[PDB]
Write a protein that binds this ligand. Structure first.
Ligand SMILES: *[C@@H]1O[C@H](CO)[C@@H](O[C@@H]2O[C@H](CO)[C@@H](O[C@@H]3O[C@H](CO)[C@@H](O)[C@H](O)[C@@H]3O)[C@H](O)[C@H]2NC(C)=O)[C@H](O)[C@H]1NC(C)=O
Ligand SMILES: *[C@@H]1O[C@H](CO)[C@@H](O[C@@H]2O[C@H](CO)[C@@H](O)[C@H](O)[C@H]2NC(C)=O)[C@H](O)[C@H]1NC(C)=O
Ligand SMILES: CC(=O)N[C@@H]1[C@@H](O)[C@H](O)[C@@H](CO)O[C@H]1O
Ligand SMILES: *[C@@H]1O[C@H](CO)[C@@H](O)[C@H](O)[C@H]1NC(C)=O
Lengths: 101, 360, 460, 110, 55
């Protein structure tokens, strides 16, 4: 499995896309938020269920090999890199990164 | 009007002889329009990939028979079992040529399995025949491999039922153990000196070492072991004066495969004279039905009698009238001292030298 | 833990009703070996699943063979739930970790002998075909009879050689003179042998026939040559659905894993992939009980307390479930054995005498049954009495006792010569007979009203 | 649950990963490479309870992972590459196979 | 056993069978060792409570 996401850099004052190259009705994609100099933090699992203890402003959807991520409203928190990870086949692989400003 | 045959062979000379025999099968059978198509595969180190590949290929070729003819397996398991189970799912008869494990005589598990070599229970039968020679009625039994130990014990019981005699002691345990001196001391106190051995070579070497430490190789001791017990490092620790048996032509694969292929050709021509000759489908995909002539073909092969030695499958689908030889450990060089006929024992002129005293 | 529940069914079983536990639910139709291997290797890459629960709708027994083989080659426990995959095989292997449900031949044989004892049919024979596994049955029967309280009468064992030529096989079939006959054969040979026996005339009402679950094949497939009243026992309990079976399998697996975790934490291990072991549940789930139901296994893989069911063939050509199996005992819904005189439309069976007697000191001695063996002593005879419980209600119980005396000696000798049959019992109405305003009572009330036939008891 | 690791390095090296928040004999341990300029990679996993080990084909023959059941430490040896390293553990609910607990990070350079 | 659990002492035995055994030993060529039976019952076949087997 090889992943590819665009744009490499995003200019906002937003949305993200991650296209792949499902497991019996279950989607296997996770999004990680990594501030500079800090370990990654899981944000979304199963491509539709958010993680407890996180702001409700985040929501995601997608199926098959085309999945997307959007955020609203915009705040100071979403200022890091992001990626998408697959788990349908071992070993796992991550995205290419996406800044924000 | 074509017959497909699948085989598993690695040696190229043996495969060439196999193709030669398949070609020569159409010689004495006239100019009939039946054809024999050959299919062969080689070894792979794994046992699932080999299984699936052989199953799919011989299903797609729509073959009738399958053979296994490789003694020198680096794996000590000697497992043609996936081939047998997969070709029995469609009740397509399978032919074994090397494996001699007594488990394969059970036809409740292996539905469509036959082989032309006898399992080791026949050696127990030959031992019971030897008991008819020297008038012995007390024995001590020790079998390690519990997969076939129960079968060997049951065969010995069936043999003894005619005389209605019972063994003085029997023993089974887990192969690979070494502290077996306690059971040796237990057997020492008894009256019989008849010791029956059927185990792995590790266990055989272990018990030979333990008995040599305990000095049970003196005069009066009766020793009798099977073929598996005197090979490898087990032969190294073998006390002098022991008696061994031999499987005649059990390794010259050439004539073995030749006879098997001749039998297959005659059986196929015999079946061609009958009606309702269906064929196996490409059961690899979406063909969940059994061969409606599966049991029919199996029973046709069961009644296969021949005279050109005689090959004859019993109700267990095993070859009878096998010739066995008798070997003796004379200063650790094997010497032929007897033979076993179909139901008789014929000693030769070589002296019967025992670990203790007299040759009597 | 990670458990996969795969069902190969034609019956519409949907999927939505199906520290780290995950369950997999699937529905499958095809049953070809390549599909099995492909599905197993695909799911084996699906998050390290250790549990496999399988059932089948077809009646092919090679599926269980392949499942056991793959379990051995993957070191993953597998269960059998329904169909040919749940059929009890011959001899499992310690290398394998495959386990089933349902009883073996020996347990069913013990149940059959219990059923025979509970009706006091102490004369029988033994008929065996060339079907594999007959010698184990023979040995088990020989060992079971010699250590029993009954002292059974066994005729010489009938063994078939081939498809009966009716030349020398009929010679052995003629010598069968008992009333109870035991048959061990496949379904295809049963039709032939039963037609042969019906031509020989051994298909009378007293010539009962008992067969194991092997010969009873499909419930829908019913040959016409089976007389209405064949004795069969099979583990097919229709009151318990497959949902309960898989739920009990899940309970077994969860209990075994939970109990094996404490002795050693890193027990659940499945192989990485098809291409390319110290502590397990192999020798650990011998003892297990969930929600009171003892679901323990044996050393060879069998069950400890299975669910066997006694079935017979009614006049409507259907396998009629009659008796179940308790924890160890045997229950019977129909205590009094029905005659089933009509096996076919060519069987006018008619012979039996309802005999009612009264307790007379030297002629009719009523004694309780011997509790040591639960059988009337051989010089007594069976009987029953409808014993009322209380005086407020008329409900009563048919307590079975033993009768002897002097007049009972007469009745026994009469059946020796005239060769008839009787069902002895006792009068609960009262004394011999008294016409109370042109109304009789007792024995006279049982022969005039023709509720009975004769009365061997002393009468004036 | 918290994780700790060794210090920086500067041939062959060894990096420790110690567990002090759970039963160390139950959960797998995975190693990650995060060389700057790209997202990440995946090396292998190890189960301390039984010692079963699997390795990635790309890193096969170069990274050896070992564990000690007594001190609850994880050892990964690279023989004969300058990148930041992480040792991590899954939540345990399985299936998802995500990474939740992260180490500190050991910076190796040649 | 209820009275004397395990108290075995060498004692003196005589009578008829003792003399018969002495005569047998004198006539033939062997040795012997006289010992008693743990109970005083001749011997009966009885089911043991386990395995439902007569012993
Ligand atoms: C009669 O014998 C011939 C020769 O053994 C059989 O032909 C063989 O058929 C198999 C199955 O189609 C072929 O295997 C295939 O080979 C191709 C590459 O050539 C591969 O891409 C497929 O995946 C598969 O492995 C085999 O090559 C072919 N051999 C020859 C020399 O023809 C024939 O099938 C037999 N009779 C029938 C009709 O089954
Ligand atoms: C092994 O088997 C082969 C084949 O049966 C034997 O070779 C035969 O030997 C005889 C005698 O020399 C010849 O007449 C045949 O023509 C040979 N046939 C073939 C196909 O080679 C060989 O002698 C046997 N060797 C052993 C070990 O017994
Ligand atoms: C046969 C055996 O060992 N019996 C035990 C029983 O004593 C115990 O209560 C139960 C639950 O642990 O498991 C079983
Ligand atoms: C067998 O072949 C014959 C002749 O073709 C045919 O009549 C018969 O129906 C076939 N088998 C059966 C019983 O279907």
């Amino acid at each position: 499995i090889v992943l590819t996401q665009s744009p490499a850099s995003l200019a906002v004052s937003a949305t993200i896309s991650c296209r792949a190259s499902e497991y019996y009705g279950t989607t296997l994609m996770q999004w990680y938020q990594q501030k500079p100099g800090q370990p990654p933090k899981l944000l979304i699992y199963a491509a539709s269920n958010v993680d407890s203890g996180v702001p409700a402003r985040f929501s995601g959807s997608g199926s098959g090999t085309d999945f997307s991520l959007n955020i609203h409203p915009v705040e100071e928190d979403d200022i890091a890199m992001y990626f998408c990870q697959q788990s349908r086949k071992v070993p796992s692989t991550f995205g290419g990164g996406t800044k924000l400003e | 009007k074509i017959v497909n045959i699948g085989a598993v062979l690695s040696t190229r000379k043996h495969e060439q002889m196999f193709r030669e025999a398949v070609n020569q099968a159409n010689k004495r059978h006239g100019s009939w329009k039946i054809q024999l198509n050959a299919t062969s595969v080689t070894h792979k180190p794994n046992a699932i990939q080999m299984a699936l590949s052989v199953c799919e290929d011989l299903i797609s070729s729509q073959v009738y028979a399958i053979l296994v003819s490789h003694p020198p397996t680096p794996n000590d398991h000697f497992t043609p079992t996936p081939v047998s189970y997969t070709a029995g799912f469609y009740r397509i008869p399978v032919l074994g040529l090397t494996t001699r494990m007594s488990i394969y005589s059970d036809k409740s598990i292996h539905l469509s399995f036959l082989r032309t070599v006898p399992p080791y229970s026949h050696q127990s039968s030959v031992w019971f025949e030897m008991m008819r020679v020297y008038n012995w009625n007390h024995i001590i039994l020790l079998v390690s491999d519990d997969h076939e130990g129960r079968a060997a014990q049951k065969r010995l019981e069936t043999l003894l039922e005619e005389r209605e005699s019972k063994a003085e002691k029997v023993l089974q345990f887990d192969p690979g153990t070494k502290n077996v001196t306690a059971l040796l001391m237990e057997a020492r106190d008894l009256e019989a000196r008849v010791i029956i051995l059927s185990a792995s070579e590790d266990d055989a070497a272990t018990v030979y070492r333990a008995a040599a430490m305990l000095n049970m190789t003196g005069s009066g001791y009766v020793w009798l072991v099977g073929e598996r017990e005197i090979s490898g490092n087990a032969l190294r620790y073998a006390p002098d004066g022991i008696i061994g048996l031999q499987l005649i032509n059990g390794k010259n694969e050439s004539a073995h495969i030749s006879d098997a292929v001749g039998v297959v050709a005659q059986a196929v021509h015999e079946l061609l004279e009958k009606e309702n000759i269906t064929d196996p489908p490409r059961g690899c995909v979406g063909n969940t039905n059994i061969w409606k002539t599966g049991p029919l073909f199996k029973r046709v092969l069961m009644s296969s009698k021949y005279a050109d030695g005689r090959v004859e499958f019993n109700e267990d689908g095993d070859r009878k009238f096998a010739n066995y030889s008798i070997m003796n450990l004379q200063n650790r060089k094997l010497v032929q001292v007897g033979i076993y006929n179909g139901t008789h024992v014929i000693p030769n002129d070589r002296k019967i030298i025992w670990p203790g005293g007299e040759t009597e | 833990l990670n458990i996969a529940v795969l069902l190969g069914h034609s019956h519409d079983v949907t999927e939505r009703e199906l520290l780290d536990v995950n369950v997999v639910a699937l529905l499958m139709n095809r049953t070809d070996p390549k599909s099995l291997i492909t599905h197993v290797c695909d799911l084996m890459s699906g998050a390290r699943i250790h549990g496999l629960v399988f059932g089948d709708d077809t009646d092919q027994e090679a599926v269980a063979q392949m499942l056991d083989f793959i379990s051995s080659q993957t070191f993953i426990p597998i269960l059998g739930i329904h169909g040919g995959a749940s059929m009890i095989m011959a001899d499992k292997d310690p290398t394998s970790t495959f386990f089933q449900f349902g009883a073996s031949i020996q347990q069913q044989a013990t149940v059959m002998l219990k059923i025979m004892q509970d009706y006091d049919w102490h004369v029988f024979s033994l008929v065996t075909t060339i079907f594999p596994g007959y010698r184990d049955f023979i040995s088990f029967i020989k060992t079971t009879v010699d250590n029993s309280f009954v002292g059974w009468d066994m005729q010489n064992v009938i063994t078939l050689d081939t498809s009966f030529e009716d030349a020398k096989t009929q010679v052995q079939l003629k010598k069968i003179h008992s009333s109870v006959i035991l048959l061990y054969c496949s379904k295809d040979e049963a039709v032939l042998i039963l037609s042969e026996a019906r031509s020989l005339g051994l298909t009378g009402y007293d010539f009962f026939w008992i067969v194991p679950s092997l010969v009873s094949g499909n419930t829908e497939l019913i040959p016409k040559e089976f007389p209405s009243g064949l004795i069969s026992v099979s583990y097919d309990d229709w009151d318990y659905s497959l949902e309960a079976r898989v739920r009990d399998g899940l309970g077994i697996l969860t209990t075994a894993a939970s109990s094996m975790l404490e002795k050693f934490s890193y027990i659940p291990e499945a192989k990485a992939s098809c291409y390319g072991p110290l502590h397990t549940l192999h020798q650990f789930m011998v003892n297990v009980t969930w929600d009171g139901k003892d679901l323990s296994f044996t050393e060879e893989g069998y069950q400890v307390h299975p669910r066997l069911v006694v079935i017979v063939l009614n006049k409507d050509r259907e396998w009629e479930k009659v008796g179940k199996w308790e924890n160890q005992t045997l229950s019977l819904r129909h205590a009094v054995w029905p005659r089933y005189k009509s096996f076919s439309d060519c069987e006018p069976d008619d012979n039996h005498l309802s005999i009612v007697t009264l307790e007379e000191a030297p002629f009719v001695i009523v004694e309780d049954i011997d509790p040591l063996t639960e059988t009337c002593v051989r010089n007594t005879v069976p009987c029953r009495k409808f014993v009322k419980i209380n005086n407020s209600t008329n409900e009563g119980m048919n307590v079975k006792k033993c009768c002897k005396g002097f007049c009972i000696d007469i009745l026994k000798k009469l059946s020796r010569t005239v060769k008839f049959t009787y069902d002895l019992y006792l009068v609960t109405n009262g004394k011999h007979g008294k016409k109370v305003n042109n109304v009789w009572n007792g024995m006279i009330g049982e022969v005039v009203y023709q509720r009975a036939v004769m009365a061997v008891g002393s009468l004036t | 649950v918290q994780l700790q690791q060794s210090g920086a390095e500067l041939a062959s090296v060894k990096i420790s990963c110690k567990a002090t928040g759970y039963t160390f004999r139950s959960y797998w341990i995975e190693w990650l490479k995060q060389r700057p300029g790209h997202g990440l990679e995946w090396i292998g996993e190890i189960l301390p309870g039984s010692g079963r080990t699997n390795y990635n084909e790309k890193f096969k023959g170069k990274a050896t992972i070992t564990a000690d059941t007594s001190s609850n430490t994880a050892y990964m040896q690279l023989s004969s590459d300058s990148a930041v390293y992480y040792c991590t553990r899954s939540r345990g609910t399985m299936i998802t196979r995500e990474f939740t607990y992260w180490g500190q990070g050991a910076l190796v350079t040649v | 056993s209820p009275g004397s659990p395990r108290h075995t002492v060498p004692q003196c035995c005589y009578g008829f069978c003792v003399d018969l055994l002495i005569k047998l030993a004198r006539t033939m060529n062997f040795t012997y060792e006289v010992h008693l039976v743990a109970d005083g019952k001749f011997g009966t076949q009885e089911r043991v409570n386990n395995s439902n087997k007569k012993e």
